[PDB]
Amino acid sequence: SLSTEATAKIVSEFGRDANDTGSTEVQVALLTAQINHLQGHFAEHKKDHHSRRGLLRMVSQRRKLLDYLKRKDVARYTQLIERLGLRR
Amino acid sequence: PVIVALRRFKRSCEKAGVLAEVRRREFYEKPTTERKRAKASAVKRHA
């Protein structure tokens, strides 16, 4: 999992404040960081199917949050995906 | 089971469970069969 220090930097970068942990932007940024981190794990551990199920949940959860944010506010959505390097 | 002394040897072999172990290891027991007997004995003591 992502460290306390890496988590706290993401929360500061994308949150309103240090305690805005629930923001859609923060959640998406945290999932993105962990998804990106795990690419190295699965490159080595191709048959770790059990852990990969957890990865796919992160992918699905991110998709659902991005979809929520898009219709709630496309301007926030558009910036977020640009900053994180997401196609959508 | 290192050891009237002969009765003491019998008792030490009962407690290590030597003969029970050997008898159980004579023939292969499928995992399905082993789980089945574990359940049946669990139910038994629970009665």
Partner: protein, 66 residues
């Protein structure tokens, strides 16, 4: 009966504490079941791990015949 590890409030069993561990093995060196010693389940698992680590380091025997 009764769990001594809950009585003493120990966090871990410690593989180094051979004095204690020797109370939980038979003369054959086999781990004694919790039903006989009255150890609690959580401590029985810690105990089994401690004994196995001690056996590896040759602080306890695996068997009466090495």
């Amino acid at each position: 009966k009764f769990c001594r590890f809950t009585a003493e409030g120990v966090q871990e069993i410690d593989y180094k504490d051979i004095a204690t561990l020797k109370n939980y093995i038979t003369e054959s060196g086999k781990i004694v079941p919790s039903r006989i010693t009255g150890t609690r389940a959580k401590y029985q698992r810690q105990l089994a791990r401690a004994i196995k680590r001690a056996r590896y380091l040759s602080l306890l025997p695996y068997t009466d015949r090495h």
